[PDB]
From a paper:
We also determined the crystal structures of the [name]–[name] complex bound with Gal, Lac, or LacNAc. All three bind to an identical site in [name], where the [name]–glycan interactions are mediated only by the Gal moiety through extensive hydrogen bonding and a crucial stacking interaction between Phe278 and the hexose ring of Gal. The [name]–Gal interaction is well-defined and identical for the two [name] molecules in one asymmetric unit (AU). To further confirm the structural findings, we mutated the Gal-binding residues in [name] (e.g., D263A or F278A) and found that these mutations almost completely abrogated the Lac binding. Gal binds at an equivalent site in [name] of L-PTC/C ([name]-C) but with ∼15-fold lower binding affinity than with [name]-A, which is likely caused by the replacement of Phe278 in [name]-A with Asp271 in [name]-C. In addition, [name]-C binds Neu5Ac in an adjacent binding site. However, [name]-A does not bind Neu5Ac-containing sugars because the key Neu5Ac-binding residues in [name]-C, Trp176 and Arg183, are replaced in [name]-A with Tyr180 and Asn187, respectively. These differences between [name]-A and [name]-C indicate that the known host susceptibility to different BoNT serotypes may be determined in part by the interaction between [name] and host glycan receptors.
Here, we report the complete structure of a bimodular ∼760 kDa BoNT/A large progenitor toxin complex (L-PTC), which is composed of BoNT and four non-toxic bacterial proteins. We found that L-PTC/A consists of two structurally and functionally independent sub-complexes, the M-PTC and the HA complex. The HA complex is composed of HA70, [name], and [name] in a 3∶3∶6 stoichiometry and adopts an extended three-blade architecture, whereas the M-PTC is situated on top of the HA complex platform. BoNT/A absorption is mainly mediated by nine glycan-binding sites on the HA complex that together form multivalent interactions with host carbohydrate receptors on intestinal epithelial cells.
Residue numbers in the entry:
A (entry chain B): 10 to 294
B (entry chain C): 3 to 146
C (entry chain A): 9 to 294
The structure:
């Protein structure tokens, strides 16, 4: 289930620190939202263990390696060796992972947060050996405050009109709080909510009782799947996504007619994957 | 003068898994490596009368003793109560090496992990001891 | 927290036919019994992030899996909420097994001695002897179980396929025929069950939804038909009584037509109300 999954790995002892790779050196670094902190989990069924492979673009064959017998962890060339395999033990009820060496299961990864690197330790109850393994998309987007542009024009953004006008349309980027959205991943529903920053509990919502209309509404309406979305990456792109509603996953966030003029409606429409249904979720500059 | 079952002096330290691998420091860890005939594979064993234990220092680094860290590894450090070892002689010169101190209110001992009796590149650890039958906790001290 | 208060059986990855077995403070490894002697409640402490493993013994009601420190022995002792009575459930992802580490000393984990047929604590390795299968006790009891199914309105009658060529399903007096016996199989992916009639190889109990409420036996090589799958829910206070609802529409429960008990009475599905004609006893064939 984790095989071939690209993930980020962060520390339970410090959730702001992520496994970071450069030129064979593994360290703990703040969130970069890029390939430097992305890892592919490669499952070997015979071993019941995983290789943890760097998604580095320059060096494409680096895996998390225990420099046995030393206390040091690095990324070395994949030679499918025992010191390059790891047991991924999920601590149930705690939603964290213990990462034990296949070469010596007595030894598990230990997060040295003050030295900002990794080492090894026998098992204990400290958070320093517990890690948060998360799908990289979720890792990047969760609690990310963003602006959302259609690819048809990256100079415009999806916005709530104002604090009282809850309609959602396309408009030129003016750095307004009504033009920014804080994305939150709902673990239970396995979906996302877009919180407009001009409000406190206002989320992007498909008004299904009014056809294809989408507007912002309160998030204290608890059980409405129209308030939740699925964000799926477009291949070959770093920031482009398709956004589909949880009530009906065939309903995708759609730029009305593909029109780019100011005040153009933002709606949902039957998914076909056209350019007016692709969006760039970006850092507000 | 002899006070115990294990005379003072220089020894080689081996695992029962291999008669050709020798205990030496590598970085900050301890491991069993190919015979080097160097001082770093020679260990000075000294009996301590007051606590009836042994302290074991590396001949190449005579002020460094076998100890343990807070991560389960056997280490080479300056003198402290973690450097005191309580051997249990189970054969001719085969011993189980217990820490003098109870660790986590248990007996803890030198432990080398094996993969089908292969210990290459394995660090020496300090793990719980329950009896005298754990092969991974049996070590040979050879006077040399 | 997703395992809190769950009642499970625990079996060995090294020998899946051996289960954690409890009696009078003694813990051993024993063949499947499908009763409380091999059932355990997982009790979660959020602060410790660890679990107590409580025996479902009916006589002694406060016994929990206990590490007899400083030995490596395991037993069941009166629950005093002690550290040596708490355990870390570490799921080996992709392997569908658990390593069960002592909360008191996580250097040590449960180890199955399948020749002495008991448990001890051990340091970790890569063998299956420290890996365990933790499963919901209903699933554990019902998975791969060959049974007969009777309405509670008359336990002398059973749900049966008419014969090898007649795939219809009706109520009839038990006669020890293979057409009257079903092998239950749990589907991990679908989280639902299939009832394989033992007179056929690939014949399963199926809601023929294209024909109203009719249920019949059909081939299981029709892959993606939720109507072939069922949820089996225990009725409270009972050891053998279940309601059986269809995966396609969970409001559709296995139903004895009119509550009639005569031979040849139709077995169907119907809107769930929980009446006695929708309650079934899944039992060992004598
Ligand atoms: O809803 C009106 C429609 O207008 C079309 O031009 C556009 O391609 C569709 O995605 C939809 O927006
Ligand atoms: O569809 C026939 C129905 O007959 C009714 O008498 C009974 O209450 C229902 O459960 C169902 O069996």
């Amino acid at each position: 289930s984790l095989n071939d999954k690209i993930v980020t790995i962060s520390c339970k002892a410090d959730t702001n620190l992520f496994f970071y790779q450069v030129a064979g050196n593994v360290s703990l670094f703040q969130q970069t939202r890029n390939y430097l902190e992305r890892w592919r989990l490669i499952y070997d069924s015979n071993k019941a263990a995983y290789k943890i492979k760097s998604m580095d673009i320059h060096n494409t064959n680096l895996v998390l390696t225990w420099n046995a017998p030393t206390h040091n962890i690095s990324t070395q060339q994949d030679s499918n060796a025992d010191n390059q395999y790891w047991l991924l033990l999920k601590d149930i009820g705690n939603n964290s992972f213990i990462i034990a060496s296949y070469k010596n299961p007595n030894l598990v990864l230990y997060a040295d947060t003050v030295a900002r690197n990794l080492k090894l330790s026998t098992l204990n109850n400290s958070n320093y050996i517990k890690f948060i393994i998360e799908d990289y998309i979720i890792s990047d987007l969760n609690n990310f405050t963003c602006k959302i542009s259609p690819i048809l024009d990256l100079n415009k953004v999806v916005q709530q009109v104002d604090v009282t006008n809850l309609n959602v349309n396309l408009y030129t980027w003016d750095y307004g709080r009504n033009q920014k959205w804080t994305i939150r991943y709902n673990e239970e529903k396995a979906a996302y909510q877009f919180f407009n920053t001009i409000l406190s509990n206002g989320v992007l919502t498909w008004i299904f009782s009014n056809g294809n209309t989408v507007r912002v509404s309160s998030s204290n309406d608890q059980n409405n799947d129209a308030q939740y979305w699925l964000i799926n990456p477009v291949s070959d792109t770093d920031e482009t996504y398709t956004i589909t509603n949880l009530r009906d996953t065939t309903k995708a966030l759609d730029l009305y007619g593909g029109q780019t003029a100011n005040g153009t409606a933002i709606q949902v429409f039957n998914y076909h994957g056209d350019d007016n249904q692709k969006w760039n979720i970006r850092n507000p500059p | 003068v002899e006070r115990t079952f294990l005379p003072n002096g220089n020894y080689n330290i081996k695992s029962i898994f291999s008669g050709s691998l020798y205990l030496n420091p590598v970085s900050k860890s301890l491991t069993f490596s190919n015979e080097s005939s160097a001082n770093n594979q020679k260990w000075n064993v000294e009996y301590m009368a007051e606590n009836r234990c042994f302290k074991i220092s590396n001949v190449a680094e005579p002020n460094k003793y076998l100890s343990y860290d807070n991560f389960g590894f056997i280490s080479l450090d300056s003198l402290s109560n973690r450097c005191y070892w309580f051997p249990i002689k189970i054969a001719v010169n085969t011993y189980i090496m217990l820490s003098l101190n109870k660790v986590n209110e248990l007996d803890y001992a030198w432990d080398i992990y094996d993969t089908n009796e292969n210990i290459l590149s394995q660090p020496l650890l300090l793990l719980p001891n329950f009896d005298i039958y754990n092969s991974n906790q049996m070590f040979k001290l050879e006077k040399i």
